[PDB]
Write a protein that binds this ligand. Sequence first.
Ligand code: HEM
Ligand SMILES: [K+]
Ligand SMILES: [K+]
Length: 387
Amino acid sequence: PIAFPFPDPPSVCELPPELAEIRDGQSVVEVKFPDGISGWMVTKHADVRKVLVDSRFSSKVTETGKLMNESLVGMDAPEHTRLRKLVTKAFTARRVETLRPRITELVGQLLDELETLPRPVDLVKNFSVPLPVRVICELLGVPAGDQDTFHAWSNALLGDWQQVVEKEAATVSLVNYFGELIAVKRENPADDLISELIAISDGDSTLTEREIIALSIGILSAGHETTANQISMFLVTLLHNPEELDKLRDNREAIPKAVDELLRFVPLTTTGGIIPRLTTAEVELSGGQVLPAGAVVLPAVATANRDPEVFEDGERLNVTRENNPHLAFGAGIHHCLGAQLARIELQEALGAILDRMPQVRLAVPESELRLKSASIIRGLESLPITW
Ligand code: HEM
Ligand SMILES: [K+]
Ligand SMILES: [K+]
């Protein structure tokens, strides 16, 4: 077995070279984690998708611990089926699409603030970290008067492992905050997700208040650090590929395809941020490998998203790519609930940056940039820019 996680490459713009070497040779390999558990990794686009779509792979694994047990992402059917069907009574494509104008305003506000800071200015702290929380607040219905405090909580959640106590205490505050917000929204409902969910809960469905709380925090948690890290990594990738970036410069029509190309090419982790699945029966894969029952299986999204069988010239960035069946939002029943909302946030963020800061560049050499050591997601410590 080879050791997983692989070494981090010198450059934030490279993936571990062992991924492509596996994908393109042995394909499915055994790995060994640092705690000595042994697993399997699959790398081809067909195997990764199978691992996410097939019924034989299970996701089932303090306030923090309870919430993890209550989150969609750790559930299997039938519990997962029920909860998702309850949440999507309110979390709809219509709700998300109709938020686009407010997302655009929130992006503009943050850029209005950014452009008055001393320069060069860190994009991470001053834009990428706060934007996904603003958007989540707007979706959920957290009022602006609660937002400074809500940011402080959210940001405490992103700590290290070195701060288990900070994070647990932030989680506790968020849990009591959302209980109070439910009573305010029951009395004065508004156009937001919590108001609708409460109305569903108060009607005849079995949706509970606690489930509303667990949904709210699960959305925060799924959608803050992911989106945050991707905004900054996307900008770096684009800058590293100036002929791709030029195709976008006065051409906001091209932004949606570019975002999907960036999602494909700039991964959250080796597995797209997806926790290894557990097989519940043996499973035959596209190449004839049969994964055994009871096995921990890593779906290598990052490399499947460059599989030369599905993506032409897949190890390079092409922001014009039309044919892009990427797995960055997963597939099957756990397919990212926020997939459309995330696309909208990244589209609006990137289109505005390029519109407003068309000469944006890095204020340090790209070799000086580095991924945070102590993060579960691939993300920059800082991103010093000027324009
Ligand atoms: C670039 C931003 C994002 C990426 C790349 C991302 C990716 C993913 C992936 C790969 C999964 C599947 C996990 C699995 O199969 O185990 C997932 C699940 C989830 N996503 Fe996202 N996501 C992002 C943003 C968001 C946002 C903004 C929200 C806000 C709603 C969100 C809400 C969730 C939820 C609730 C789940 C669990 C769905 C379920 O288990 O049924 N995500 N996401
Ligand atoms: K790795
Ligand atoms: K959830």
